[PDB]
Write a protein that binds this ligand. Structure first.
Ligand code: GTP
Ligand code: TTP
Ligand code: TTP
Ligand code: MG
Ligand code: MG
Ligand code: ZN
Lengths: 550, 651
């Protein structure tokens, strides 16, 4: 209803028909118009825009930035560091059509906690002329606040400086949360898709950042209201924060308490077999950038076939979802199960080939864009973009993103077309695993054939919940169990209308996480005890990403 | 059909010119929006799908007839269906004192100066997302004054916690000024007090600096409409307001980034006698600092509160507020001061929409009438008809905007508009929209008083009288329209950026190249002496002064100055003095800065080739197009780039 939202609606309504013509191939357009492929962000296709990125904030925070005429010097405080993080996210959100993430929020904001502490001790020195130079690089335990009742001497000055640092970090974290939840910067709804990942920083500064962000989340925004953005994600590592002996276990417990009330942060299990990296050393200051980072849109970019297995500075180029329920409904007419399965697999093969060709064509369209079209993404944020002239193509660096082949309604793909759904039957579970494994193998073949990074995606429900189901119900009527819910069940998820305990849901949904390298989530609807149990079952059965709601 | 195929091909070519990022008349319409970016491409697609829609469905047959015939230029056509209003002056005090709930974002009242500055930036961005024009903060010093005191009290209580003293008397104690002083030679209570000031000033130096950066960054990037920002200051004779103004001026002088010129926000100095203009006034030193900063960074511009048309009889020097009755400008040129059914105040109100009139075509159409009296009578008949058309268009847009509900603009119609607090989210804005203004514009007066009707007003006296009577007739017609349509109509010296060359192109296509009127790719800005005419600054001021009293919807006095006179700050004081003498309201001094794109080193010479710091291949040029600064010369319209190339310094 806002003028900006109306402008973006007009732009989308004048772009989607345009991309449908002269840009989509004949086969691609035929597949899209026949309710087979949903090309996500079909608007912004003419812009040659990429989907998402994990911002390397060290570059921006240490060298400033110069985007157009907007130039910022290197940060000297937490107050400026948080604002620069917000600025980077907002600026890159206007250059891309997907989420923006901070892979290491605790690692990126941590030197500036020490710089703020040094400013406090230097202000106390100029107030007192006491030459407190031994407190500059001294090791701090946790940056905690104490009443200061009877701590006279240099102890009083040290504790007062720590108190001021804690207050400054608290104000900066409140500012970051409120700016990401209040500033309406992008187009349309205007709220930036913001995510931050933290949990694996054991230093006192990172612990202070995490503690203050958790306290600010716990206190809410404004008058105790829960914050919608940024999507907070807690990185779970055994030996760092999971076991009671671990360094950041207490903060982890605190995180659970916050999830008990504000339902944030989410949890990213770095102990999953697919999320492990052989170059993660617990001592290296750069032990991040070798660990998995996830967005609120569930986009996972970890493995690269011609580079490093990292999530920083990389992202998704574009992803499109495949309607497998439609193929299953089409093959429903075969009475023999074996022939019906063979027909479904042939249809899936054809649609997978079409989707791969569509993603390749969109890649060829995007690669001709010049670096001048993305002032911040292709100058500080992408992998290798610092070696790009403004008037040269991005083809030398675009072959590092991920092409996503998404799917939806596996439970609906099985509820009545080929028997029962995977929540209630073991045969259905085996069939669903077979389908997703076939998709993953074909994605690997596509990656070899087209020289790209293809990954299977458990597409988030937002923006696609009812688009497929309405057309399927129009074409095929009300199929009992399939086209009768007004929404397709989320990908490889137990249907919400099926009453199963969290243990059974986790056991059913665990295998699909390894197959969906492009993204996945565990969803529990329901006290820190229950959150602890959810994380425990995420640990017991290999699961990448998880969240608890109400 | 062949016509349908041709139209489809034309639309496809327009939509692919945006995709391929080529310098065109559609990808350079606005020099603030970057067309290369995906957000710029989306905005251009929205503009191209909205302008034909409003032309073919929303306007009337008379309005379409005028627009297609190169007589009327409706401004911000792309935003017509959105029912958006043009501009507003922010009443920042209510936002800072009670917080705001916009969308899902809730903010509680600020407790320190940095929070206040960030909330000001947030309010400007949010209202920009709800409007299609510039965003200005009046009484910036007044609105940010209490939070300097709040920060001082926080520093005092921190020192009290550290030391255990009783600093209660240092909570509301009067302070002459917030000046940072070295703590070399004072011990005990006094030292502590000074320390608080030396911290408070620092807490104000970042908060202002951040502001200057944020408005230069959230404008450099825009998903919605770019953030056109401006602030007004100069009349707060208190320690906190003086501190705010001093920090703003110092941060602007230092620059943004690697000592570069902040393109935004546009800063305006509120010049007034008895407060900040005379040497015996309180803020004269800050006025001199403003002139010094304007010498280098071309900011702030100067607004004359002593002008006869900018005087309010409810202004008390002892009144705590004292700012509700002072005039502020939206930065580019907008002036919203008078109100026929309300209080004379610029606070929480602004322009609704405006449209420009092509007097040049009306004058050149009267080419064959050899008798000057009949020629002028015919010209005035055409002017009256077109003025009636423009008033009808403005009233039509007003009637369309009235139906907008309060939830279309969340922040604007709950905190930012006069009387918008007494509204439900679903109720319309009829009870409060009438406090806005409707602007009627004109262009090419210098190229309208020419060989068709003689020679231009920069070189003839009866030409000056003819121009004055033309503008006076337009002003009287606007007053009649205000009394007729029950609105607030005003004549506005419309800025010429996208309209610089839009009329002249069609006039060359139709009539051709007439020496002095259509021999250049642009029209001389409204009631301005030609930029291609060698005139002194004093003569230009004398010629253009009487127009400001007539054009009460907005005006500006531009002075191009050479690089040698750029350094000297007394020339800007001379410009302000000649504004004061010749009853001029708003003015600005301009000059071309040679900036290295890689570095940002902005030289002051007329022309530079390479960057002395680095040695870059080429150096771009920075100047103000019509009402705002623009970074690179490759963002200008070719019509306006021709005007820039032919500019002559006045010194
Ligand atoms: N929000 C916003 N408004 C602008 C900007 N630039 C110009 N304007 C509007 O433009 C008005 C000044 O007139 P011009 O900019 O010369 O209008 P124009 O060049 O003819 O552009 P259009 O009328 O839209 O075709 C101001 O009152 C603003 O409302 C901008 O960058 N952002
Ligand atoms: C605080 C803040 C800074 N910035 C920008 C302005 C600065 O150029 C950059 C770093 O800010 P600062 O930390 O203030 O850098 P500085 O050079 O001013 O350091 P010092 O005060 O010690 O001399 O970040 C913002 O864009 N927004 C903000 O809110
Ligand atoms: C500093 C800052 C605050 N805010 C928001 C967060 C707050 O909800 C609101 C006002 O914050 P404050 O008034 O500064 O914080 P507070 O009310 O909690 O004061 P205190 O700590 O003494 O109790 O402004 C931003 O959105 N951005 C910012 O940069
Ligand atoms: Mg606070
Ligand atoms: Mg600073
Ligand atoms: Zn240089």
């Amino acid at each position: 209803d806002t003028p900006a939202g109306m402008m973006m609606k007009f732009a989308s309504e004048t772009t989607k028909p345009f991309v449908d013509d002269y840009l989509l191939s004949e086969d691609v357009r035929d597949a899209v118009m026949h309710n087979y492929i949903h090309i996500h962000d079909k608007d912004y296709y003419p812009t040659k825009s990429l989907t998402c990125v994990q911002h390397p904030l060290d570059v921006i925070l240490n060298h400033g930035f110069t985007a157009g005429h907007g130039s910022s010097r290197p940060a000297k405080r937490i107050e400026t560091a948080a604002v620069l993080a917000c600025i980077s996210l907002e600026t890159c959100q206007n250059e891309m059509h997907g989420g923006q993430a901070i892979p290491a929020f605790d690692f990126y904001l941590a030197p500036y906690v020490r710089m703020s502490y040094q400013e406090e001790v230097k202000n106390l020195e100029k107030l007192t002329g006491e030459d407190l130079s031994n407190l500059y690089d001294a090791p701090i335990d946790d940056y905690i606040e104490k009443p200061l009742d009877g701590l006279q001497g240099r102890e009083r000055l040290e504790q007062h400086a720590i108190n001021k640092t804690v207050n400054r970090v608290h104000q900066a974290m409140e500012a970051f949360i409120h700016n990401m939840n209040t500033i309406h910067s992008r187009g349309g709804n205007q709220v930036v898709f913001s995510s931050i990942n933290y949990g694996t920083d054991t230093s006192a500064e990172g612990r202070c950042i995490m503690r203050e962000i958790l306290q600010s989340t716990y206190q809410g925004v404004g008058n105790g209201e829960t914050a919608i953005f940024p999507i907070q994600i807690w990185k779970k590592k055994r030996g760092v924060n999971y076991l009671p002996e671990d360094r950041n276990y207490d903060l982890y417990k605190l995180a659970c308490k916050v999830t008990a009330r504000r339902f944030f942060p989410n949890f990213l299990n770095l102990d999953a077999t697919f999320n492990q990296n052989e170059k993660w050393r617990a001592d290296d200051p750069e032990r991040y950038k070798w660990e998995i980072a996830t967005m609120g849109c569930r986009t996972r970019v970890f493995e690269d076939r011609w580079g490093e297995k990292t999530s920083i500075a990389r992202g998704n180029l574009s992803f499109s979802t495949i309607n497998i329920v439609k193929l299953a409904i089409e093959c429903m007419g075969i009475e023999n199960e074996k022939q019906r399965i063979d027909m479904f697999f042939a249809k899936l093969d054809n649609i997978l080939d079409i989707t791969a060709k569509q993603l390749d064509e969109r890649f060829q369209f995007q690669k001709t864009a010049m670096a001048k079209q993305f002032p911040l993404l292709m100058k500080y944020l992408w992998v290798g973009a610092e070696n790009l002239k403004p008037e040269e193509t991005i083809e030398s660096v675009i072959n590092h993103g991920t092409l996503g082949i998404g799917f939806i309604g596996l439970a609906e793909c099985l509820v009545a077309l080929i028997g029962k759904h995977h929540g209630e039957s073991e045969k259905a579970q085996e069939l669903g695993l077979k389908i997703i494994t076939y998709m993953r193998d074909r994605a690997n073949e596509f990656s070899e054939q087209y020289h790209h990074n293809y990954s299977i995606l458990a597409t988030p429900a937002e923006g696609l919940s009812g688009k497929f189901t309405k057309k399927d119900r129009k074409q095929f009527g009300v199929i009992p169990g399939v086209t009768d819910r007004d929404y397709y069940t989320n990908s490889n998820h137990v249907p919400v209308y099926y009453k199963c305990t969290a243990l059974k849901k986790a056991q059913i949904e665990a295998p699909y996480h390894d197959l969906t390298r492009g993204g996945h989530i565990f969803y529990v609807e329901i006290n820190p005890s229950v959150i602890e149990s959810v994380v425990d079952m995420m640990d017991k059965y290999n699961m990448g990403y998880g969240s608890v709601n109400h």
